């Protein structure tokens, strides 16, 4: 997260860290959507151009965290994966269309002050909240700036970062890039003419873009950190998987495989 700030304790209790078993490293963000299901970006698990193709046994999920690197002894919970479900029409060859995956935990997780699920939007919520100029909130342990390279240490935060960003009009998203955008995506971030800054960055993928409903006071996950070109560049905007658009797939996986 670029130009964000340190999260408060318990601010994003649905935030999940996807962690590689060996070597021991941050892989991506993710979100907790029940006691047994985590949502993330598909490219965190499957990206053949970078030689990435993780199986269940290669990864863990760490839930309830604040510190990036420390094991938060009596606070975080570590879960293993039963199964990964990648969207069958995830397009890693071209534009990361449908950049979405579900991960079923081997056992349910007990909730706490630090560990709690986000809501997923229904049609009405999505039509109401996913409008240009409304702001949502992105969280992650990714890079603090676009990184020029190749090493990284000072570029990584000590604790989870948060930034609030406005949803951008589709024609603006489209004209900002030559990568083909789809209805399975939306973009967010400030225009150069707005002054304020901020974006997700590498290592933030899979993390949630959430919005707080002014009708019921709940947080809803509207997007998944997916892609961008650089980070926090003027005239560029972060791209997010559009959760509601993919919600029938989400529901089909959980209904058929879930617990």
């Amino acid at each position: 997260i670029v130009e964000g700030s340190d999260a408060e304790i318990g601010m994003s209790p649905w935030q999940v860290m996807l962690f590689r078993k060996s070597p021991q490293e941050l892989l991506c963000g993710a979100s907790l959507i029940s006691d047994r299901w985590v949502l993330t970006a598909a490219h965190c698990l499957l990206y053949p151009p970078w030689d990435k193709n993780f199986t269940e046994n290669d990864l863990l999920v760490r839930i309830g965290k604040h510190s990036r690197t420390r094991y938060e002894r009596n606070i975080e919970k570590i879960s293993m994966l039963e199964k990964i479900y990648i969207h069958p029409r995830y397009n890693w060859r071209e534009n990361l269309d449908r950049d979405i995956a579900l991960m079923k935990l081997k056992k349910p997780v007990a909730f706490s002050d630090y560990i709690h699920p986000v809501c997923l939007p229904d049609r009405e919520t999505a039509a109401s909240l996913l409008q240009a100029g409304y702001k949502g909130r992105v969280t992650g342990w990714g890079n603090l700036k676009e990184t020029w390279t190749a090493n990284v240490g000072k570029g990584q935060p000590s604790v989870l970062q948060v930034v609030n960003l406005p949803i951008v009009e589709r024609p603006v998203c489209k004209d900002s890039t030559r990568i083909r955008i789809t209805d399975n995506m939306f973009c967010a971030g400030y225009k150069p003419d707005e002054g304020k800054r901020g974006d997700a960055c590498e290592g933030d993928s899979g993390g949630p873009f959430v919005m707080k409903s002014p009708f019921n006071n709940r947080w809803y996950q509207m997007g998944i950190v997916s892609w961008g070109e650089g980070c926090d560049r003027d005239g560029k905007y972060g791209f997010y998987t559009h959760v509601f658009r993919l919600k029938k797939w989400i529901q089909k996986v959980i209904d058929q495989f879930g617990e």
């Binding site: 318990g10 601010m11 709690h116 609030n164 707080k212």
Partner: peptide, 29 residues
Amino acid sequence: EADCGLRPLFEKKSLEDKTERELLESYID
């Protein structure tokens, strides 16, 4: 419980986090 999206340390304690007001204000301005 059906308590998705309500944070134990914030909504459940009637406590606001430091920047959520920004989000709410964006639905106006």
